[PDB]
Design an enzyme around this catalytic site. Sequence first.
Site, PDB file in Angstrom:
ATOM      1  CG  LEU E  42     -56.867  -9.603 -28.720  1.00 38.36           C
ATOM      2  CD1 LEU E  42     -57.254  -8.765 -27.516  1.00 38.36           C
ATOM      3  CD2 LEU E  42     -56.775  -8.742 -29.970  1.00 38.36           C
ATOM      4  CG  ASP E  43     -50.101 -10.302 -30.719  1.00 40.60           C
ATOM      5  OD1 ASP E  43     -50.974  -9.508 -30.314  1.00 40.60           O
ATOM      6  OD2 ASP E  43     -49.002  -9.930 -31.183  1.00 40.60           O
ATOM      7  CB  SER E  44     -48.414 -12.956 -25.822  1.00 42.57           C
ATOM      8  OG  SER E  44     -47.378 -13.072 -26.778  1.00 42.57           O
ATOM      9  CG  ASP E  46     -52.243  -6.982 -29.813  1.00 42.79           C
ATOM     10  OD1 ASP E  46     -51.314  -6.188 -30.073  1.00 42.79           O
ATOM     11  OD2 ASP E  46     -53.110  -7.312 -30.649  1.00 42.79           O
TER      12      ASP E  46
END
Lengths: 174, 57, 606, 18, 88, 99, 459
Positions: E42-44, E46
Amino acid sequence: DSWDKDVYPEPPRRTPAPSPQTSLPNPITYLTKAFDLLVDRPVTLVREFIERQHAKNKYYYYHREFRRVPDITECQEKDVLCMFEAEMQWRRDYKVDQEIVNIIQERLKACQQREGESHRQNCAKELEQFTQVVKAYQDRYHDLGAHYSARKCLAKQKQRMLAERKAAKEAAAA
Amino acid sequence: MNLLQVVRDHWVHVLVPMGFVFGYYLDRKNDEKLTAFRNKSLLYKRELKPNEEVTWK
Amino acid sequence: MNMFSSLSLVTLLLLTMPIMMMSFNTYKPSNYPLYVKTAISYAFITSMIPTMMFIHSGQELIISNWHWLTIQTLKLSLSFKMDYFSMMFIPVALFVTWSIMEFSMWYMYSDPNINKFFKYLLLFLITMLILVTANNLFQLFIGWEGVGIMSFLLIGWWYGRADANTAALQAILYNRIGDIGFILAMAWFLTNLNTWDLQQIFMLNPSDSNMPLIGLALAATGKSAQFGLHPWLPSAMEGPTPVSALLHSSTMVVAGIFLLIRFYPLTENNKYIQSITLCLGAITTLFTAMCALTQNDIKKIIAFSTSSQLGLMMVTIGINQPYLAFLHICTHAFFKAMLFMCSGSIIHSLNDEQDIRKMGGLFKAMPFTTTALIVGSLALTGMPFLTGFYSKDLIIEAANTSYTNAWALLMTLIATSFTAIYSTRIIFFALLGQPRFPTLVNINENNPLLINSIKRLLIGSLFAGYIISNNIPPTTIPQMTMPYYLKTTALIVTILGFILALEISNMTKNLKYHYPSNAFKFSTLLGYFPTIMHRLAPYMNLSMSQKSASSLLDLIWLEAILPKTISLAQMKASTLVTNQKGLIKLYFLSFLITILISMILFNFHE
Amino acid sequence: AGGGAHIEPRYRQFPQLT
Amino acid sequence: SDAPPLTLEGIKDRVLYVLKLYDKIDPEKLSVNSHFMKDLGLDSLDQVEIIMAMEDEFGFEIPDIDAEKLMCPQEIVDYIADKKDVYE
Amino acid sequence: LRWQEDPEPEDENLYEKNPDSHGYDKDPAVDIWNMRVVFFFGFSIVLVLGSTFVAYLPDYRMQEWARREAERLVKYREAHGLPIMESNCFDPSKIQLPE
Amino acid sequence: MLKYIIPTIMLMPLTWLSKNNMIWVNSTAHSLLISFTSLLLMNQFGDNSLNFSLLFFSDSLSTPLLILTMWLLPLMLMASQHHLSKENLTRKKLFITMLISLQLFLIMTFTAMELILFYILFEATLVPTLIIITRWGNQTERLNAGLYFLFYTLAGSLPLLVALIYIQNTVGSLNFLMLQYWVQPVHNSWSNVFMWLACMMAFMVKMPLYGLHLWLPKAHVEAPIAGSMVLAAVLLKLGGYGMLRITLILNPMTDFMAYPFIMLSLWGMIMTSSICLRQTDLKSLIAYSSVSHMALVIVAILIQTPWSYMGATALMIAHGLTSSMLFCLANSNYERIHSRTMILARGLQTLLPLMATWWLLASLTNLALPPTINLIGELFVVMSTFSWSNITIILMGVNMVITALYSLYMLIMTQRGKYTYHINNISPSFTRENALMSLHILPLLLLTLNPKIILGPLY
Ligand SMILES: CCCCCCCCCCCCCCCCCC(=O)OC[C@H](COP(=O)([O-])OCC(O)COP(=O)([O-])OC[C@@H](COC(=O)CCCCCCCCCCCCCCCCC)OC(=O)CCCCCCCCCCCCCCCCC)OC(=O)CCCCCCCCCCCCCCCCC
Ligand SMILES: [Zn+2]
């Protein structure tokens, strides 16, 4: 009895009679009878018990009276003994006049409340008598300063006597 | 104890009370010298009572 | 009469008993909040007996039971007035206070100092009765300043909160400016009429009353939070909700309006004052009503609603209808208090969340608060035959059919439209829609204290105006004939408000974007008056106290021109007369100079 | 806060009513 | 204030209950130690929404200086229990 | 150091050695007797008996006499038709103007 | 007046002959009895004063000041017991002797009948007052404050000496009763303009008048608590009491000579009231407050109307108890943190629940909350100044608003908010401190029930 009615006049009373034209009971009528039994009589009885104690130990106190003494105008300059008494007499009279103004003020305030919405017309005499006494008091006691003295009031009367006299010369000129 | 160490360390408690009595006393003496106008003013002069001799002390 | 007097003063004494019994601790704690409630309950029923005697026979009296001070010709005595305004207002104040205190026993149950809180509430109630019952200005000033302090102490209840102290001190500041007007009124009356009693003032009936009346108007401005001195009331909501309902909604802010009512025998003959009072209220009833159209915090919406109602009360005094202005005070006490309690009930349920944007779906969740909230809003807007109809509609009727400023008349009618907008804003954003509050919330309102306290005001906010309207003795010539379009101005104005308010709400739910404007940010930011004035005025005055008053003068120039120059000069001369080498050759030459000078310049030898 | 009936809280559900 | 006191289990259950309703995490593998970035991809950006979904659950803001530091649903539980005075 | 001086002494808490301290003196015996004289004379004697003394002063500055005296002068003047208050403070028969 | 002079002197043998550990108990207990007996001075009359002898007399103006004077010495002994605990026994007794000597000169100043006797005793209070500041102050600046205090007073007092002797030569007496009947008007000339200034300047420095007040923020701030109480409570009232007596022989010149001074006082209210808003030092905020309260008294005295005189007398008594009470409250905080900074200690209400109530009562009395005797005294002055000129209501009203700020600002800064984390020696309030505040406020609030005893000779 409780107070003198000459100095604190009280008009005669005029209360309408109860003339109910309905059928429901009036709570005020019932409360008054309830009030008297629970409050008035219990209060009176305690007062009567206290009252009877006084009669057994009656005693009196007197209102002080000051005999007139020579005023300021009758005293020579730099005569402390004669100026001293002439000054105290001025001060005692000054206190009395302040209360006289207080008495007439009370009449004016009492009338206005007694008359309710008719205070504009029915309190004319009191308002008229209030104006006159203030005029006399203001004349002989206003603008003396903190250090008022019999000397200063006299120096004010003599100044006003000149003003009135000078009016007569011009008034009595036509 | 008894009349010792309870009067040596408490006798001071009369200094100020005694001062008031002594101070009060002198005031009465001072008045006796200012009695020139006693019963002689133009506002309180009157006749002495049968037993009274001076209007005030 | 003996019964009228005794029951009137026992009402005031009764309220003071809990204070006296808390001075020597002759009671049992943990029952004190219920002890105070009972005293208010019994105080209420006692006050009814004098009120009924007034309604029945129209009997009034004045009691001067003590002689306090006598300043030469001025006599100051502890006096009490029992007349139309005193007898009518006291029962309402006790009735609303009764409900508020019972609510507080629920709202503030977990507060450690709930004992002290109730004492402060009782203290304010006592002072407000001193203000209302006062017969002379000096006795009036005691209550006038007393309520301001009790407002200071209750607003700053959570004294740890920096913003509570700022709001508390702010309220004192604005009222203190108003007191300047009060003092001017007192000074003028003494020098011109030689009294402070209202009995002698009316008897003399001054003609040149512009100065004292302006002073009273200025005093009424600050205490009733009109324009110019308005900002403090919306910021008074820092205090606990029960404080807001009692002091700053119904029975303290009206004190400014009340003061101008007691002096109606003067203002009736002074059209110039009637012009200023009409205009001063008209701008407030519109500006404050405008500010509420966009407020989110639930209490602040009601706070601004109060300001608009207060303005409308001053307009009524401005148009020379003193009794209708009073009749709005009595009616306004009932439903305005209820909205705060209803709002406070919502806030506690959602765990101290006061933002309407985070409420919703509560129509079914909290039926009792919902019904109470609905009934109050309809009373406020002026729904026919409720408490607010018998006073607000008579006010609008008297405005149109009168010789009134056109612009001030328009502002009153426009402001009435805004009344139905923010009222709908609370209903729409707090009851309808879908829930926005957190997932885990305990929405409970079943505590009997809450229901019973509100259930007493709900009855009042329905038949309070109906009963008082049909019982007060007539004192005017009501204007009951006029064009149809004027007789039904409020109804059309109010109904159009709901419709106009209704549509605005629905357009929110659409998925269009939001465009900020200069009218939305003007109303949201209170017109910029607090942002500018509360930053500019403190900055100017505070800076002066340091740069000019303190440093420039006291620490620099008052020192320089006397202690320093005088001191420096002596040091200089001290070096001249002592900078001596110690040589005989030079001392004795001076002696030769002195002798010569003593004969040539000064001729000391003859 | 204190007294009266007692309602157990519910999670993401319509609160229990009397 | 008449509310039910929080519990360590209660915090944990609700925290995971929010994650179970997010479409970018598989409930099957979702454990207390499943690092949001490395273990879930999960990207930051997110993670920011993840935290925002929590503070709207417990209804209390979390400062950005600390929120970005939370990279494990146990850390969120520990963070809230530490900031709400819960011990058992 | 610049000289021989004792270090800044610490302050002594009066509750440690006498948790029932009244804050007057270290000695509990003398400490308790200081609270008695201040409270007794300060509160029981001066405030209470002084207030009682002040409450019952013998007609302070003869203002009661002035009100009681004023009533007579109103009673006498009103009955006789005289002015309630004369506008001249001194009788003009014994005053001589400059010219 | 020997019934109060001799007992006061006997307090000196009492202190020196007492046990080592009972110097405070005996002086505190016996000096309260002297205070109790002072109520016999209330035997005033409506037309004449109490003329005891050829030297001493007492009237409605001196009586309230005497009672306040003899009431503080017990309170100044209570306040001093803390910071004098670790002090030589002999020095602890000279300090008490200075307080006893100071009261001795005061009870004779307010009762002296002859103005030269007033001057000597009025001037003799400098020595014991100066000694207290310099010897028992806690700072380096006490030495400079005693110089400012001494030379500001003398620089104005010495010209007054020449004026009084001149008056005696041209009048024959300085007995106050004589001057009431031999007073002659003061014609307007350059010679008299320098007799009016000479008589009034001595007292206006001690009020103090705005501009000549630079000594007060030094003396009151630097003196010990015992010195601050008397300096602010009774010593400032020597100036006002002097003007109320010397103005008798300065008419009608006082009507136009007052303009430079009324204008200074009316505007100085706002200047000194505003200074208190930006004061870092808690004890200095109270000192500047005193100048703003004495500005009204100067104005009231110079306009010479009975309301101003009645109000002026009440401000002197009302400020005496309020200003002293504030100094004790501010000092109580000092004895814990040992620093005069106002912001250093905050949130003390959560730590000292009862001590924060006195702050509330001290502040509410300072800002003249009705019906306290501060409001009564301050109201009569405003009422009388309005009659002087309607425009003054603007300045009087403006000063009221600022007074409501620097009073509640002091209350909020120290008694509200978060406590300072690093201060942990805030021990509970001793019974000595609580009784010390109760002895200020309770007499001050009781006088509201019978205010006529502090409304001066013009009542
Ligand atoms: C001769 C025989 C008889 C003997 C005579 C001898 C006389 C000697 C004197 C004896 C008198 C008693 C002295 C006190 C005894 C000790 C009592 C005790 O143990 O205390 C325990 C008591 C309870 O214990 P606690 O809970 O632990 O409290 C500690 C907390 O810190 C507490 O914190 P807090 O914040 O909760 O409270 C602090 C403060 C209160 O804090 C505040 O509220 C601040 C704001 C208060 C002022 C706001 C109102 C201003 C307007 C006042 C208007 C009054 C005049 C009205 C005139 C017109 C109408 C009449 O305390 C109070 O003052 C409470 C009273 C408040 C004023 C009440 C005035 C209205 C009452 C009704 C009056 C009418 C009575 C009629 C009776 C019939 C006639 C006989 O605590 C205290 O009260 C400690 C403080 C003691 C202060 C005493 C001084 C009282 C002065 C009143 C306030 C100032 C009013 C200013 C106007 C002045 C008007 C005169
Ligand atoms: Zn210390």
